[PDB]
């Protein structure tokens, strides 16, 4: 029995990075030979495993995390890299084992005039733990007591939009990215093939 790789890669509507979408994949005969036929795969790299030797190994539990980010920020989705989206709304451990897959999707996410539907967290109190998600949209702290969802000396608001348009350079075009996380220790294997 096969498992939904055609649902996490061909999902109907991807999520924004500050509210990424986890999914579990177990109890199937996993086939990694369908991914290559998807896209030219602007980013396809694996930590702890090779992509060609993927179709013969067995794993314990496989998570799949999908979201959408900018072009020049794909480099931040890697262990131990400090940035702004790898700091405030998606962090993965320094002991990572898995793969990341990112492909350009300016075809489907860029509206003419600006797509103000993909937002990301810009302000937080402290950096967040690996694989942690927060959705609260509380107003951020300022030097003095913030205003009230309005302008002022500082009194800022946390989230910021993206503004994708079809003419933006490749560095500012929207990219869809999905991350697979495996486990290998003392495995009474549940998913492989």
């Amino acid at each position, epitope marked *: 029995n096969l498992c939904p790789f055609d649902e996490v890669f061909n999902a*109907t*509507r991807f999520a924004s990075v500050y509210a990424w979408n986890r999914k579990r994949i177990s109890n199937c005969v996993a086939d990694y030979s369908v991914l290559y036929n998807f896209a030219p795969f602007f980013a396809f790299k694996c930590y702890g495993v090779s992509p060609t030797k993927l179709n013969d190994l067995c794993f314990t539990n496989v998570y799949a995390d999908s979201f959408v980010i900018r072009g020049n920020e794909v480099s931040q989705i890697a262990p131990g890299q400090t940035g702004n989206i790898a700091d405030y709304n998606y962090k993965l451990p320094d002991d990572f084992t898995g793969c990341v897959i990112a492909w350009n999707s*300016n*075809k489907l996410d860029s509206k*003419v005039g600006g797509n103000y539907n993909y937002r990301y967290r810009l302000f937080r109190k402290s950096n967040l733990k690996p694989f942690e998600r927060d959705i609260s949209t509380e107003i951020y702290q300022a030097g003095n007591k913030p205003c009230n969802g309005v302008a002022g000396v500082n009194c800022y608001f946390p989230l910021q939009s993206y503004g994708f348009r*079809p003419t933006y350079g490749v560095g500012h075009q929207p990219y869809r990215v999905v991350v697979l996380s495996f486990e290998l220790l003392h495995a009474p294997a549940t998913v492989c093939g």
Partner: antibody
Amino acid sequence: ITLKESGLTLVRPTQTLTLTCTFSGFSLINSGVGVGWIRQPPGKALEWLALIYWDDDKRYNPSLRSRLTISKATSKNQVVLTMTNMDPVDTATYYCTHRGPGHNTPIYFEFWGQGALVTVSS
Amino acid sequence: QSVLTQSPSASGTPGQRVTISCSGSRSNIGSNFVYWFHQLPGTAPKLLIHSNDQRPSGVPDRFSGSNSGTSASLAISGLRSEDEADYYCAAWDDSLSSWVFGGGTKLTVL
């Protein structure tokens, strides 16, 4: 991919115009897909009315805003346009058009309807 | 500034190459993609060129597009007799926040 408009083609002034674009070959639940409306007077240049993306982003023509309302009935795969306070200058043909994906940038107005001549008189 | 202007007439002759101009401004034609449509008597228009240089599947090779600063051009090669129709510009204007179009050119072959 096919589109077809329908409604009442003749209406007196100070009444409201309603139009219904029924389509076939795509669904307004996928990413990319969107539907818009474009009118053209008899012997004049084209004019853009309104647009509605798949995530319900109702863009309007500013000068014609405060008069137009576009809405979708996805279950029936159809879009409805409504414009109040019609006038004799609004006699034109109204096309409903489709915006899907291309190969490196979104396509706009790739497919058109067949029009619906609308006369506003007495 | 907020409306594109085209010359009304082209007037080529078979087997020749002609160009059609479209002048805009810093805000609409110089910072967005420029489309180019084609409209025949008694029929809805039909796309010719999007993204200033790309052709939808089903358009012959002879149609070419060009954008340069705040100006746009369409180049038709191998002019033929089945092409005498209206040609329209199209661009999204950020200052007006709407799509704007041009007047149109006749292009009747001799």
